[PDB]
Amino acid sequence: FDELRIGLATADDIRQWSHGEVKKPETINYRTLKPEKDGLFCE
């Protein structure tokens, strides 16, 4: 901890941060109560 550099986040940086891509608005199936595939909360 010496300096908290801040700046504009370019598209390349946001892609680098991401561990995947979100393609659906699904959150959790109404029965199994588990996170869905490729949506929000996806494991």
Partner 1 sequence: ALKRLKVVSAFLQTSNSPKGMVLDCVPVIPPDLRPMVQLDGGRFATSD
Partner 2 sequence: ASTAPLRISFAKIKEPLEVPNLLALQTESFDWLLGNDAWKARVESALESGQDVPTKSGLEEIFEEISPIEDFSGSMSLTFRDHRFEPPKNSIDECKDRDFTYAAPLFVTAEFTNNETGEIKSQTVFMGDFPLMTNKGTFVINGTERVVVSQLVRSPGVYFDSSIDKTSDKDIFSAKIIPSRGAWLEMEIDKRDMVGVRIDRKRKQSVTVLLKALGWTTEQILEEFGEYESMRATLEKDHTQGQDDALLDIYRKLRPGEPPTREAAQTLLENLYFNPKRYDLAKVGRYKVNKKLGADEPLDAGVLTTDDVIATIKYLVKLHAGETETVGESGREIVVETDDIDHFGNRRIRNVGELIQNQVRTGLARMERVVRERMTTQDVEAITPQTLINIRPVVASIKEFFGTSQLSQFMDQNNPLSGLTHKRRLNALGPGGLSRERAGFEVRDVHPSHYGRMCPIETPEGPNIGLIGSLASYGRINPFGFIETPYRKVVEGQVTDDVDYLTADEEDRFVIAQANAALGDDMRFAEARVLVRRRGGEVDYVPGDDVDYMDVSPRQMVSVATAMIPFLEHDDANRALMGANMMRQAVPLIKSESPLVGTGMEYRSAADAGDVVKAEKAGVVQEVSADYITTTNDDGTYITYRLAKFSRSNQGTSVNQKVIVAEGDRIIEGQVLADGPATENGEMALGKNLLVAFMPWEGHNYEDAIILSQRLVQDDVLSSIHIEEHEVDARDTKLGPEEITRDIPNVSEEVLADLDERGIIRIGAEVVAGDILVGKVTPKGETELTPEERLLRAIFGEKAREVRDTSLKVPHGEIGKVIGVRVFDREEGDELPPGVNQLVRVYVAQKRKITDGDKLAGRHGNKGVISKINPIEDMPFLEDGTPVDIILNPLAVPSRMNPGQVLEIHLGWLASRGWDVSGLAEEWAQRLQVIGADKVEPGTNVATPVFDGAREDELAGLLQHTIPNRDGERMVLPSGKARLFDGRSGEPFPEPISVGYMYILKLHHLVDDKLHARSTGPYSMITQQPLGGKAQFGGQRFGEMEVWALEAYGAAYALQELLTIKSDDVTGRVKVYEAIVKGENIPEPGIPESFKVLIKEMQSLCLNVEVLSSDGMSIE
Partner 3 sequence: VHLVGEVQKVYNSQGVSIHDKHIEIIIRQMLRRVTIIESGDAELLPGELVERTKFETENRRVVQEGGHPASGRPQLMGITKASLATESWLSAASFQETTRVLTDAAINAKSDSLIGLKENVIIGKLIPAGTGLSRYRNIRVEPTEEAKAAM
Nearest approach in angstroms of CB 38 to partner 2 is 19
Fill in the amino acid letter for 8.
L
Q: Among 27, 25, 23, 22, which residue's Cα sits nearest to residue 41?
A: 27
Largest CA distance in the chain: 49
Nearest approach in angstroms of CB 7 to partner 3 is 4
- Residues binding partner 1: what is the number (CB under 8 A)? 16
Q: Based on the shown chain and the rule CB under 8 A, indicate whether residue 14 belongs to the binding site for partner 3.
A: no
Q: Which of 24, 28, 37, 38 binds partner 1 (CB under 8 A)?
A: 28
